[PDB]
Short mmCIF file of C-alpha atoms and ligand atoms in Angstrom, two decimals:
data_model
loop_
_atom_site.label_atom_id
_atom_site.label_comp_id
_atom_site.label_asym_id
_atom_site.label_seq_id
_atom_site.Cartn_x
_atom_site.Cartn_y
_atom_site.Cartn_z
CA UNK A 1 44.13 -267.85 22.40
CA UNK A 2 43.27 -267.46 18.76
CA UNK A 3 46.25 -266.49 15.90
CA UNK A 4 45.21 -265.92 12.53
CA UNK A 5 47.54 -266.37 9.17
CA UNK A 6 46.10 -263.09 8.13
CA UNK A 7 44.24 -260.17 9.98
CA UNK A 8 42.66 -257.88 7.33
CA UNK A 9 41.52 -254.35 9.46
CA UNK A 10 39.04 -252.75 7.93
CA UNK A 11 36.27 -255.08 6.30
CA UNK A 12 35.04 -253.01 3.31
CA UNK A 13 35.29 -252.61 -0.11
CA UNK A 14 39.23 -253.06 -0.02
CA UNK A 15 39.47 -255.79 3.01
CA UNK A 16 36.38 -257.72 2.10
CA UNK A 17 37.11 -258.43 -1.03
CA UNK A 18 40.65 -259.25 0.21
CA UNK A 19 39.31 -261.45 2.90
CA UNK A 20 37.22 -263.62 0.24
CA UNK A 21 40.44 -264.33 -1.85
CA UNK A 22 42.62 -265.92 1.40
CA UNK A 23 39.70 -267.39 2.58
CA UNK A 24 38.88 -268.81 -1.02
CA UNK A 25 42.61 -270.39 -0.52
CA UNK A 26 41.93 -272.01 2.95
CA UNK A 27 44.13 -269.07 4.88
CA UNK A 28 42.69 -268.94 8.24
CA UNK A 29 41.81 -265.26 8.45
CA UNK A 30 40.08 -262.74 10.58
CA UNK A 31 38.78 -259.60 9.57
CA UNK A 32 38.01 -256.66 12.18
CA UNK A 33 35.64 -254.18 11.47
CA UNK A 34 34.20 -251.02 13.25
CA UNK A 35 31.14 -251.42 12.07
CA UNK A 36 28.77 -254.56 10.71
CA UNK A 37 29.96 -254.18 6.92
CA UNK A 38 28.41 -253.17 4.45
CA UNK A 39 27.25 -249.97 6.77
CA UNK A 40 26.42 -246.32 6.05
CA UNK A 41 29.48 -244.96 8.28
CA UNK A 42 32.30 -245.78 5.59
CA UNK A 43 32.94 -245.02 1.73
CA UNK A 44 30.88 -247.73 -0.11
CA UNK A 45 26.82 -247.08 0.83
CA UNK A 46 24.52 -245.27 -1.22
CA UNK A 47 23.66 -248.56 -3.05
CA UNK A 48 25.51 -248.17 -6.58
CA UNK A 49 29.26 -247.60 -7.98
CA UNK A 50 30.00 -247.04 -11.84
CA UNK A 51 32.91 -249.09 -13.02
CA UNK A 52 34.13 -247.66 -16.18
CA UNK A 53 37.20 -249.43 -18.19
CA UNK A 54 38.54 -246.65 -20.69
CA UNK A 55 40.10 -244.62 -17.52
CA UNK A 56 39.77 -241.00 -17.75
CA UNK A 57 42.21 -241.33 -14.39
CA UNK A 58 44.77 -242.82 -16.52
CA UNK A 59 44.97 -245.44 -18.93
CA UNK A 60 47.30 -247.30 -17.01
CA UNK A 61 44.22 -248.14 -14.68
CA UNK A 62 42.82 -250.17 -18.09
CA UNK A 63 44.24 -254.18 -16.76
CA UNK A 64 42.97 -253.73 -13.30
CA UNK A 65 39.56 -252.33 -14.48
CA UNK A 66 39.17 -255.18 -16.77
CA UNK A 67 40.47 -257.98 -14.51
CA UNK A 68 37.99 -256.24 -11.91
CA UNK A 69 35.51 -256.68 -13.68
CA UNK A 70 35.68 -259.93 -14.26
CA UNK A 71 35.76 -260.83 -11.28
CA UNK A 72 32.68 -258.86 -10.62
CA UNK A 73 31.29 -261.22 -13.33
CA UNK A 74 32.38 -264.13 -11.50
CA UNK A 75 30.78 -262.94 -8.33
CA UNK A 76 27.43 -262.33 -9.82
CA UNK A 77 27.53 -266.03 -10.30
CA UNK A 78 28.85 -266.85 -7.14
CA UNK A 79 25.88 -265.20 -5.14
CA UNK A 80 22.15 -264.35 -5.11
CA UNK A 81 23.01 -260.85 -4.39
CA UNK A 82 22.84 -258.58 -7.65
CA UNK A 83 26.03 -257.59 -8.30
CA UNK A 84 26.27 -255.53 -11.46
CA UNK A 85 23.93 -254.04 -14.30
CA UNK A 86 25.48 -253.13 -17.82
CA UNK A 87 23.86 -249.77 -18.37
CA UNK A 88 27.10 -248.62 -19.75
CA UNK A 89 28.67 -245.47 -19.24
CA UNK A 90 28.61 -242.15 -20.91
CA UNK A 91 31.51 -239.43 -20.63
CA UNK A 92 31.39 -236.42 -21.75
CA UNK A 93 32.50 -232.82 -21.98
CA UNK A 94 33.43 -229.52 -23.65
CA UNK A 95 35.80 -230.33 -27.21
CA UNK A 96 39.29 -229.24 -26.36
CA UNK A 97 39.03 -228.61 -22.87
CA UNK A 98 38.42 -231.77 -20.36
CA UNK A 99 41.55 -233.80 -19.75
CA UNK A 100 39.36 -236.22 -18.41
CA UNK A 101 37.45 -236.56 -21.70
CA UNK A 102 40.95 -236.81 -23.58
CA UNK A 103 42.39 -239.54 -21.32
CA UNK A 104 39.34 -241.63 -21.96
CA UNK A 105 39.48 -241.28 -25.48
CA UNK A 106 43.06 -242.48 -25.96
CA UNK A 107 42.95 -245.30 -22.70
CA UNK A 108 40.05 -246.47 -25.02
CA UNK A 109 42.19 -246.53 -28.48
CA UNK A 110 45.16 -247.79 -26.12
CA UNK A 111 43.79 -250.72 -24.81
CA UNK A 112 41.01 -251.17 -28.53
CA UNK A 113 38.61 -251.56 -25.88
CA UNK A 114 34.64 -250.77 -27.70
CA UNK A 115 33.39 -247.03 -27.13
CA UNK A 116 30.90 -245.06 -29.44
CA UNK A 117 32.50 -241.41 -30.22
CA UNK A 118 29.64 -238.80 -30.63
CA UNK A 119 29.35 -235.06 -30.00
CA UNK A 120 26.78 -232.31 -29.52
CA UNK A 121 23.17 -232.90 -31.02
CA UNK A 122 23.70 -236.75 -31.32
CA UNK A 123 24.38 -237.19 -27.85
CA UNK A 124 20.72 -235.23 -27.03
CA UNK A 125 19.35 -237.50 -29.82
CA UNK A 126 20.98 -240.80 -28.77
CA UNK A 127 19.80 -239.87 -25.38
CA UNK A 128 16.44 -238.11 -24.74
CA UNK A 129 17.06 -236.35 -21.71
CA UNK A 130 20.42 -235.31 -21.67
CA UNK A 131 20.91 -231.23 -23.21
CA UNK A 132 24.44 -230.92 -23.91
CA UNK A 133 25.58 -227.94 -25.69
CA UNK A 134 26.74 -228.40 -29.63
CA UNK A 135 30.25 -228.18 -28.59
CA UNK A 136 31.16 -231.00 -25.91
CA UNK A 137 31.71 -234.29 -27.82
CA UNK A 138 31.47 -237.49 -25.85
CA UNK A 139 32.34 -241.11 -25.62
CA UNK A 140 30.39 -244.22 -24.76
CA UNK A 141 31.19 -247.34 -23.27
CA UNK A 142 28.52 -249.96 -23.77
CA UNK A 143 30.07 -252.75 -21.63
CA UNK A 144 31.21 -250.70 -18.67
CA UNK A 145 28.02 -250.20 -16.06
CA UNK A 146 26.88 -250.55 -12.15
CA UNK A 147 28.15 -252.38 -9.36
CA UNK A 148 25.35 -252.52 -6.36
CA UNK A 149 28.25 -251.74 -3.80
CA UNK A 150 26.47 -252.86 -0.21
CA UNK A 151 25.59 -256.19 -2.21
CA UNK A 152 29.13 -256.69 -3.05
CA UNK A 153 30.49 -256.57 0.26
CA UNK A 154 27.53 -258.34 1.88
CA UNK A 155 28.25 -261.04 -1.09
CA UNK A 156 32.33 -261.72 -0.31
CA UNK A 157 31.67 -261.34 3.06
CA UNK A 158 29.24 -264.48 3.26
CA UNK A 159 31.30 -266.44 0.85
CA UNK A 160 34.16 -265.72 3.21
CA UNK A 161 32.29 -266.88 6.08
CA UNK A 162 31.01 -269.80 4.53
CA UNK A 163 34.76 -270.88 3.81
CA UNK A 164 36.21 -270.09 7.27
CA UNK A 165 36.73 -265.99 7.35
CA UNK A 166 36.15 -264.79 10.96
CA UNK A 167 34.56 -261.18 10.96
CA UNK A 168 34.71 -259.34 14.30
CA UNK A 169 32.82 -256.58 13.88
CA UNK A 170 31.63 -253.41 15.82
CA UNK A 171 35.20 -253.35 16.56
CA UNK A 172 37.64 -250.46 16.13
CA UNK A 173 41.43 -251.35 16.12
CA UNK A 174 43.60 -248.72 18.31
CA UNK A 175 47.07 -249.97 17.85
CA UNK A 176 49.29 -251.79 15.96
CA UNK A 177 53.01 -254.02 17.48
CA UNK A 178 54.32 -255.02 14.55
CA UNK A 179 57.48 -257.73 14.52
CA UNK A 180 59.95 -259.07 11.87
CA UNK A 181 57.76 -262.69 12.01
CA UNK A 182 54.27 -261.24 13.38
CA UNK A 183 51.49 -258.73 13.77
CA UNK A 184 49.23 -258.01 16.93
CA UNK A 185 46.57 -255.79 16.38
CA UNK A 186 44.79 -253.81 20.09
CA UNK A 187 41.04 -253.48 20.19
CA UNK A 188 38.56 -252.76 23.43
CA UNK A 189 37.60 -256.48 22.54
CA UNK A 190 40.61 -257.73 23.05
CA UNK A 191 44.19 -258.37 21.29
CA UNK A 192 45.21 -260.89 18.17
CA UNK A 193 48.07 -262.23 16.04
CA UNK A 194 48.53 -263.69 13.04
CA UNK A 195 51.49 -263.55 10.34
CA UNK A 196 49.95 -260.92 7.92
CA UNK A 197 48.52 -257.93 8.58
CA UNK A 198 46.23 -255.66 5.64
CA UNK A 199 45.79 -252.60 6.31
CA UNK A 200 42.38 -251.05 4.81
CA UNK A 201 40.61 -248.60 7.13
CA UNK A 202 39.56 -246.52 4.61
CA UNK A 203 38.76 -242.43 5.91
CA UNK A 204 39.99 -243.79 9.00
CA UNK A 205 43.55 -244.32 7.62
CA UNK A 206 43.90 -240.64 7.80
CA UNK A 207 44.16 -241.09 11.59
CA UNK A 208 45.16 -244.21 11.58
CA UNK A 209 48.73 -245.04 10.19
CA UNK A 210 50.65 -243.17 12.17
CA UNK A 211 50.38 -245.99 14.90
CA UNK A 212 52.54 -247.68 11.87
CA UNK A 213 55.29 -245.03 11.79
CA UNK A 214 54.03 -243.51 8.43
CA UNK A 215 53.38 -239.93 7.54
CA UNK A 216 51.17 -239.72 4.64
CA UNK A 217 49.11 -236.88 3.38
CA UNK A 218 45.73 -238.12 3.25
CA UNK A 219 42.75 -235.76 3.50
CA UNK A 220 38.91 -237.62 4.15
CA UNK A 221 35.91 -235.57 1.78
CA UNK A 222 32.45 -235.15 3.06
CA UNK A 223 30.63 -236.13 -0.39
CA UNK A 224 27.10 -236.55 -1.23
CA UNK A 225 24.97 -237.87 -3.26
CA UNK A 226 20.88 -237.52 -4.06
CA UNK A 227 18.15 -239.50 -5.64
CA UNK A 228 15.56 -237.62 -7.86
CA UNK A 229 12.41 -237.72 -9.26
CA UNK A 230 12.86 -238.25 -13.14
CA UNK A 231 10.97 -238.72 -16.02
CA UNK A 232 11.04 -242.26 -16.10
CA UNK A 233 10.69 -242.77 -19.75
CA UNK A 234 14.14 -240.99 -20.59
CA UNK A 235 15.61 -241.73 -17.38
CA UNK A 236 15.37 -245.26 -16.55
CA UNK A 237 17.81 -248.51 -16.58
CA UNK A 238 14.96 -249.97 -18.66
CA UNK A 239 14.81 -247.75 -21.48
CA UNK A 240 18.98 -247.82 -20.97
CA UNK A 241 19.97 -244.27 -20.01
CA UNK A 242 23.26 -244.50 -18.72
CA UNK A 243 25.53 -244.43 -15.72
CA UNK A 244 27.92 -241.47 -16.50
CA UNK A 245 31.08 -239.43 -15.50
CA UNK A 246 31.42 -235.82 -17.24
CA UNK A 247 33.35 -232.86 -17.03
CA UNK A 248 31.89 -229.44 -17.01
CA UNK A 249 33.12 -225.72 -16.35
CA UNK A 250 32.71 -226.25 -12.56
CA UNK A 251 33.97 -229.44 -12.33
CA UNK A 252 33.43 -233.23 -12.30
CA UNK A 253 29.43 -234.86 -12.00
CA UNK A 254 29.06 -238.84 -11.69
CA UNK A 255 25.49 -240.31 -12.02
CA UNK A 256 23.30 -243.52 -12.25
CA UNK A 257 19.77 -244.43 -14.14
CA UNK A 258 17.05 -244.48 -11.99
CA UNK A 259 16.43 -248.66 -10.74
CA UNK A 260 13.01 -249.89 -10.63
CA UNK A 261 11.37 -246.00 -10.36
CA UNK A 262 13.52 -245.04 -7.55
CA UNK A 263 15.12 -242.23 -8.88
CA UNK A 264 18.07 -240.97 -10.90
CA UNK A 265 21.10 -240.82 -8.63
CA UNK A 266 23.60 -237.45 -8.89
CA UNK A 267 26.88 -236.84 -7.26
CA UNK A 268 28.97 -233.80 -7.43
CA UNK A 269 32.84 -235.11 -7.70
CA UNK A 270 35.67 -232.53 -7.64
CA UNK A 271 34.18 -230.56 -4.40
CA UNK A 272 33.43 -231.77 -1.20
CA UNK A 273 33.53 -230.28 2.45
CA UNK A 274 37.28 -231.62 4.29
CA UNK A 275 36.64 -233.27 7.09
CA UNK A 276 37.30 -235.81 9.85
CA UNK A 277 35.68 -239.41 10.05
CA UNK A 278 34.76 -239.33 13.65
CA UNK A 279 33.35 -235.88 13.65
CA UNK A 280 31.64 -235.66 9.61
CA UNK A 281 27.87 -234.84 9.79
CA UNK A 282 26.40 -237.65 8.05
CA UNK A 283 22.82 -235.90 7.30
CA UNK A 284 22.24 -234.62 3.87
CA UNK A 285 20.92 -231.19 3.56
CA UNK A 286 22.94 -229.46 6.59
CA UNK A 287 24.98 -227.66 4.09
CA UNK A 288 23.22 -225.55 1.17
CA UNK A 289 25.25 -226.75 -1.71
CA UNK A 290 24.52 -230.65 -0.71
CA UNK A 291 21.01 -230.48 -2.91
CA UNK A 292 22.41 -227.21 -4.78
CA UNK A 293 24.86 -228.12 -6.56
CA UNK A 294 23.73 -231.02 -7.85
CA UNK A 295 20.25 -229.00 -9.49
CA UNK A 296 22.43 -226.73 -10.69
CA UNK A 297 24.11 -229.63 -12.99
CA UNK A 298 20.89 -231.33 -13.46
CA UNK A 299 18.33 -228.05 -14.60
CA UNK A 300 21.09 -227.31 -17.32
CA UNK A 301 22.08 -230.82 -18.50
CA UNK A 302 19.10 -233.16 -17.65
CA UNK A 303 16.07 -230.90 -16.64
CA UNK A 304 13.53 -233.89 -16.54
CA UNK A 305 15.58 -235.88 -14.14
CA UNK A 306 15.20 -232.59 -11.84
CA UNK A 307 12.11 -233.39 -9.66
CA UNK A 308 11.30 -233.95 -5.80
CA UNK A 309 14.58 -234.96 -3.89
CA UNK A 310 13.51 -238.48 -2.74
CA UNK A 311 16.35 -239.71 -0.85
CA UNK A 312 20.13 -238.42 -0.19
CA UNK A 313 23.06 -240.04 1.41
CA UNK A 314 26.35 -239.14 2.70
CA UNK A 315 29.80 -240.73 2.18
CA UNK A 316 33.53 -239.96 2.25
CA UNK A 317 36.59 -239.87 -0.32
CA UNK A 318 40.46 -240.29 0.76
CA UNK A 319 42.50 -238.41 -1.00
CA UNK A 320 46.41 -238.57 -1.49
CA UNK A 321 48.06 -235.38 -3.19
CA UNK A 322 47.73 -237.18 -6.82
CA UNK A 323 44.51 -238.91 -6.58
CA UNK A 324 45.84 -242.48 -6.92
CA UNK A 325 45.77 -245.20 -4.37
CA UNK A 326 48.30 -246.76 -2.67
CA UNK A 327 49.05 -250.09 -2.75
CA UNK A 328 51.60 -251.83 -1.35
CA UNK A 329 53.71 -253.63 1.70
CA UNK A 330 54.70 -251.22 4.51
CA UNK A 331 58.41 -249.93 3.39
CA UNK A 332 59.76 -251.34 6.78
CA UNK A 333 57.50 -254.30 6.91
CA UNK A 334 57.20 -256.62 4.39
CA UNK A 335 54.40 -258.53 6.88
CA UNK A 336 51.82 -255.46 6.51
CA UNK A 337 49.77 -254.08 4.10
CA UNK A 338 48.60 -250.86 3.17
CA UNK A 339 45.62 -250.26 0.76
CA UNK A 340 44.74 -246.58 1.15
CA UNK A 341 43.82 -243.33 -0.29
CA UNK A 342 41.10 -244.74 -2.92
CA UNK A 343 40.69 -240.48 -3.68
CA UNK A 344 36.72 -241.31 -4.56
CA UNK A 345 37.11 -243.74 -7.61
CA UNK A 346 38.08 -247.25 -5.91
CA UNK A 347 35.26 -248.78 -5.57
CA UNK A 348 35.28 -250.28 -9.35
CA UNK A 349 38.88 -252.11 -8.59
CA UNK A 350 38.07 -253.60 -5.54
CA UNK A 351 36.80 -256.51 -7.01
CA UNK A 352 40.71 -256.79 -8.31
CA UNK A 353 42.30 -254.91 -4.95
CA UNK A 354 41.19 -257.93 -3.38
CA UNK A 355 43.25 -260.03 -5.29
CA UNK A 356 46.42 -257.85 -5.13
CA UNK A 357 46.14 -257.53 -1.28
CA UNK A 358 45.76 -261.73 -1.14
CA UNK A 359 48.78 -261.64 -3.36
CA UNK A 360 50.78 -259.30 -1.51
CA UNK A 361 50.35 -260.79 1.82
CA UNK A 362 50.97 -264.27 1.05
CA UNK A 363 53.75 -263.53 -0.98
CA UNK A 364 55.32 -260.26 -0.83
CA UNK A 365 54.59 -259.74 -4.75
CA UNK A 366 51.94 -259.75 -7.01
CA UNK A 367 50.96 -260.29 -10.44
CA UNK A 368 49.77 -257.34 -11.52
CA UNK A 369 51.66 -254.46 -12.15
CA UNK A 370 51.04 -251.76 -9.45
CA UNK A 371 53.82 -249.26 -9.73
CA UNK A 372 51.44 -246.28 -10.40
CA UNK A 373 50.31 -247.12 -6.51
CA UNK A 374 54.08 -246.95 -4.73
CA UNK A 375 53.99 -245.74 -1.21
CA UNK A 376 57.31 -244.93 -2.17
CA UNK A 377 56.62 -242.38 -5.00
CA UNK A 378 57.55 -238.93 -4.92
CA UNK A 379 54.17 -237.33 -5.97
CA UNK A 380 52.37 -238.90 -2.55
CA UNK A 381 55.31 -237.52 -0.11
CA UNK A 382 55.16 -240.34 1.97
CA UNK A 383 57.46 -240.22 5.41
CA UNK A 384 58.17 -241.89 8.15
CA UNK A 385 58.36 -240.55 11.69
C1 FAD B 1 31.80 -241.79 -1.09
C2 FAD B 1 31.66 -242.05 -2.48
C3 FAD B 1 32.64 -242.85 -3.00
C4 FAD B 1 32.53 -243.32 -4.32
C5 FAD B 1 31.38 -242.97 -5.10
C6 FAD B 1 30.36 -242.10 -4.54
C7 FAD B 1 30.50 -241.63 -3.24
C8 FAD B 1 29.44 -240.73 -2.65
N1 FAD B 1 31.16 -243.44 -6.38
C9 FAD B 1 32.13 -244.29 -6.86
C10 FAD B 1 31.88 -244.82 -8.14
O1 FAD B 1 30.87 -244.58 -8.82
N2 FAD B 1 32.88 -245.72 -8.63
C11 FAD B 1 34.06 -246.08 -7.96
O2 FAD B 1 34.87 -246.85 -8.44
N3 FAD B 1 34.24 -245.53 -6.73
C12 FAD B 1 33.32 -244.69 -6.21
N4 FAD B 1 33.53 -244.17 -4.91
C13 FAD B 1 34.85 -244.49 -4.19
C14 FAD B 1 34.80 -245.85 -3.50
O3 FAD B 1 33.46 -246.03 -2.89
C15 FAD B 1 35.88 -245.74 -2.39
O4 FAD B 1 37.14 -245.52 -2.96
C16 FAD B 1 35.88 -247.22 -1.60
O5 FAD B 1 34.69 -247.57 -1.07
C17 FAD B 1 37.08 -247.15 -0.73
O6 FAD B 1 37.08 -248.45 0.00
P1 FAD B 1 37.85 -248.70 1.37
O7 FAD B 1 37.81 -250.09 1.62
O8 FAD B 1 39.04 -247.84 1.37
O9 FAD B 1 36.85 -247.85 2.43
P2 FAD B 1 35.49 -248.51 3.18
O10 FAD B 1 34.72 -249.22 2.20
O11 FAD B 1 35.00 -247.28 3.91
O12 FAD B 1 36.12 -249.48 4.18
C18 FAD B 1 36.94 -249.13 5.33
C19 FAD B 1 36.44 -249.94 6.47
O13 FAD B 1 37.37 -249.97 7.55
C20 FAD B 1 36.72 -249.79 8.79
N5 FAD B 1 37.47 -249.22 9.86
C21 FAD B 1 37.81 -247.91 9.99
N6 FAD B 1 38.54 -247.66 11.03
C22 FAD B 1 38.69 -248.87 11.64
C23 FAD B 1 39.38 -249.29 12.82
N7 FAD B 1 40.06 -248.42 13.59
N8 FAD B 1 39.34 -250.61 13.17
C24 FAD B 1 38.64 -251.48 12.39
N9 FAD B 1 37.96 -251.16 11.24
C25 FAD B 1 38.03 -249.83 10.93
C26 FAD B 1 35.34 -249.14 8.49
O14 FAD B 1 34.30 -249.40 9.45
C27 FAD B 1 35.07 -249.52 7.05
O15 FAD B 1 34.13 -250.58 7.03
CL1 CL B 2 37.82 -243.07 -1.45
TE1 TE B 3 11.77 -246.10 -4.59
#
């Protein structure tokens, strides 16, 4: 008995966000969730998110990092949640031989945004804590820092609320009938319509769109994280150690400052076991290289943040075949759309994903340019069945 102007599926970091924006405008819109957002079953938990503007990615992520976080600014003051810390964030990485590194260093110069450039001993000095051989170099970003993802969510969902937003949650969409002038979504709970349909299911789109005709390559990560005992006079928010993204020999390591004594936070980035979303073990420790790999980084680049492992969480990354999203209306329906495929770094735009997906489903277009995330483009191999 109830139509909806817009029906976001998938209330998380993508639809929630998307979900305050209409409901900010006075669209009548219902979100449907699995779960009771934010929850530990998805891709934002574990409490905390870097957001870093000079994009090792790809500079051409630079606008929509900086537009995101503004509007994380603007939620900070829109809530009594915490939102986001400036800590800052530190990359780093052999000289000569971390793309990663490189594209930071010119998105920085690109877009003049403010970065200190230091290498070998004066990051150790800068930094007690951190043992970095003499050769990596590095580059700081003072301004870039911490989102407190669950807050986030739990923030733009009760602003949406308060404005309207109907959240259906514990709820798990089946199918999809799309027309040329409607959308009906099928659910245990029942059946709704509305004129819009966003499409946000995050791990779950891997399974998911093919009730919309698409064939996408999209392959869901088991990846954890784990909270350490540190020393916390080197490693704490207070005595600013920072939030950081660096490249080694074996790959990609993210991390966080410990918060009020609980811990620094460690997450191995370029490996993760490939699974399914409705089968993933969700304990940490099950597999050997969960608290492995991440002591192996930690005894050879910040032995004092090494100690007891006090807490450990597990989450999930959706990959496409180039490791950037996809963003955009449904090539044969104008009335849907698709944010999927966030490939582990999305959380930081959601903030401005939000926005787009508003945009895009009240008006077909957007303001921001979002090429780079065609479902159209070559590189993804997107098809239809
Ligand atoms: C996992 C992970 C990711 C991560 C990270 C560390 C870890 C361990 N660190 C990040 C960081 O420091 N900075 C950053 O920018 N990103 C970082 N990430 C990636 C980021 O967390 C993910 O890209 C982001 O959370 C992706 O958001 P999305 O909105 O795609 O996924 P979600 O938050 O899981 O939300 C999906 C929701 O949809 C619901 N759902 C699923 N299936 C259904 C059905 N059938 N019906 C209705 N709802 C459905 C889920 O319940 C979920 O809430
Ligand atoms: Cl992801
Ligand atoms: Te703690």
């Amino acid at each position: 008995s109830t139509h909806f102007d817009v029906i976001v599926v998938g209330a998380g970091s993508m639809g929630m966000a998307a979900g305050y924006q209409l409901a900010k405008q006075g669209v009548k819109t219902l979100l449907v969730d699995a779960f009771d957002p934010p929850h530990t079953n998805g891709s934002h938990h574990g409490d905390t998110r870097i957001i870093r503007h000079a994009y090792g990615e790809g500079r051409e992520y630079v606008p929509l990092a900086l537009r995101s976080q503004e509007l994380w600014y603007e939620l900070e003051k829109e809530t009594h949640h915490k939102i986001f810390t400036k800590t800052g964030v530190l990359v780093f990485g052999p000289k000569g031989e971390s793309a990663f590194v490189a594209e930071t260093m010119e998105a920085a110069k690109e877009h003049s945004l403010t970065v200190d450039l230091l290498e070998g001993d004066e990051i150790n000095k800068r930094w007690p804590g951190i043992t970095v051989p003499e050769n990596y170099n590095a580059i700081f970003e003072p301004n870039s820092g911490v989102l407190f993802s669950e807050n986030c969510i739990r923030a733009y969902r009760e602003l949406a609320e308060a404005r309207g937003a109907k959240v259906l949650t514990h709820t798990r969409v089946e199918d999809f009938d799309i027309s040329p002038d409607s959308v009906k979504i099928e659910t245990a709970n029942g059946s709704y319509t509305a004129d819009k349909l966003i499409v946000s299911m995050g791990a779950w789109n891997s399974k998911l769109l093919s009730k919309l005709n698409l064939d996408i390559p999209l392959q869901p990560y088991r990846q954890v994280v784990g909270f350490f005992e540190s020393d916390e006079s080197k490693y704490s928010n207070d005595i600013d150690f920072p939030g950081f993204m660096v490249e080694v020999p074996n790959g990609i390591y993210y991390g966080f400052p410990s918060f009020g004594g609980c811990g620094l936070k460690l997450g191995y980035h370029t490996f993760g076991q490939k699974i399914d979303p409705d089968t993933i073990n969700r304990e940490f420790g099950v597999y050997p290289e969960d608290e492995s790999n991440l002591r192996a980084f930690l005894e050879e680049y910040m032995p004092g943040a090494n100690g007891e492992l006090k807490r450990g969480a597990v989450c999930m990354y959706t990959k496409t075949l180039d490791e950037h999203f996809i963003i955009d209306l449904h090539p044969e329906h104008s009335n849907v759309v698709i944010a999927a495929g966030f490939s582990g770094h999305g959380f930081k735009f959601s903030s401005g994903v939000g926005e787009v997906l508003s945009q895009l489903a009240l008006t077909g277009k957007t303001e921001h340019d979002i090429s780079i995330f065609s479902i159209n483009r070559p590189a993804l191999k997107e098809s239809l069945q």
